[model samples]
Target: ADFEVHMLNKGKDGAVVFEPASLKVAPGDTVTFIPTDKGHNVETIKGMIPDGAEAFKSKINENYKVTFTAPGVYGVKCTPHYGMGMVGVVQVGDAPANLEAVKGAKNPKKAQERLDAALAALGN
Candidate 1:
């Protein structure tokens, strides 16, 4: 269960934003954003988490990453640093308030893990 994505550092300190912030994800799926440096987070401000909870604020400072495997449009961002640009975006699934599922086996972490394992096996 490894839900993570390398949020590589940008040209500036924290001046890098993900093009398509809105991510398409299904229910019971979490998306993890692993930062390369300090000063990063999956801030949960009202209207941030798609169909999820904006009441929970998840930030990591230990080269860590946060996982979102619920359902919602997450409006993510990094505190303006040196002088780059806007932060990144996390659009979970298509429908904002629509988080549906099938067979009941939706694990974004597992999906991400599988991808990672495969990539690791490649030894790239």
Candidate 2:
């Protein structure tokens, strides 16, 4: 099946955010992450994985794939550019959908809206 994903620099267009910041995946499906102009990790912040949620992160500074079998909120953040808002999220099976996952994705809501809008523009 096709997976929905996007990548971004810690400062794409001069802001700390993730491209297409919100994405949805099915159980046992693979979500591949690619980086652009910078390094990032699919790291899930402790206490921020949402209820009954946990994320499998890739080693730092590389394109990676994580197969999600569980459902919950998973966030990705750049190792060094987190302050720049270079952060994103993955919604596993039964996880939050649309605006919920994109809201303040990385401690900011407007940024999430920007990314979410882009995905919507794709007309998927």
Candidate 3:
């Protein structure tokens, strides 16, 4: 299966954000992060992926796609604008199985804050 996300300068809320800031995909499914604006790159956060899963980073404003083979929550961010709350979440499976792990993982304070908001939206 395939899922899609958009990297943007302003979300529906008029703040730096990723459209559909959170997503859900099944194991083996793929998600494509599309940059609708410039200066954005898709990268995975450390301490977020399930065991055996390797993190990835993409070039700025470039199209990037990742397949979720493990069941957990994946934290994603835009390297250049992370401080602006440019982050997102991809939940593989029905729920965020690794919500605590993702929350416990050390992250830039702003990034962590944005992630927490996303997690809240997911009802985690």
Candidate 4:
């Protein structure tokens, strides 16, 4: 399967945001992060990915795609606006094997908030 996530300035006040901040997909699904603004890059949180799965990162102002080969929860954030809650979750398959680990990882204030929200979206 293929999915697209838009990086946007959400809301009327233009808050930095990732549209559809949480996503659920099966293993081998591809997610494309589309940049709708500048100064944004996608990067995976340390220890928030499944074992053997390499962390992903994207160049600023560039669209990037990732294929999840592991069945777990992935915490993604925009380096530039991470402190502003520009974070999201990618759930591969039906299990969140690293949900607790991801939650326990230290994060910036707003990034943690967004990450929590994304986890809640998964009922985790």
Best by lDDT: 4
Candidate 4 per-residue C-alpha lDDT over 49-80 given as tens digits, one digit per residue, 9 for 90 to 100: 88768987899988998998889999998888
- Candidate 1's C-alpha runs over 4 A off are 1-3, 11-14, 18-22, 50-52, 63-70, 80-85, 98-124
Error of 4 at 77 (Å): 0.7
> 78-111 in candidate 3: lDDT tens per residue?
8888777788888877665677788898877777
Superposed model 3: Cα runs more than 4 Å off:
none
Off by over 4 Å in 4: 12-14
**Whole-model lDDT per candidate:** 0.41, 0.55, 0.81, 0.85
Worst 10 residues of 3 by lDDT: 91-100
Query: For each candidate, how many residue pairs have backbone atoms clashing (under 3 Å)?
Result: 14, 4, 0, 0
Pitting candidate 3 against candidate 4, the one with the higher TM-score is 4
Output the worst ten-in-a-row residue range by lDDT, candidate 4: 9-18
Tens-digit lDDT string for candidate 2 (18-79): 56566767767776666654556666644335555555556655677667665655666655
User: TM-scores across all candidates?
Assistant: 0.48, 0.61, 0.89, 0.92
Residue by residue across 66-113, what tens digits does model 1's lDDT show? Answer: 555655444444444212333333444444442222112232343323
Cα-based lDDT at residue 12, candidate 2? 44
- Please give the lDDT score at residue 121 for candidate 1: 31
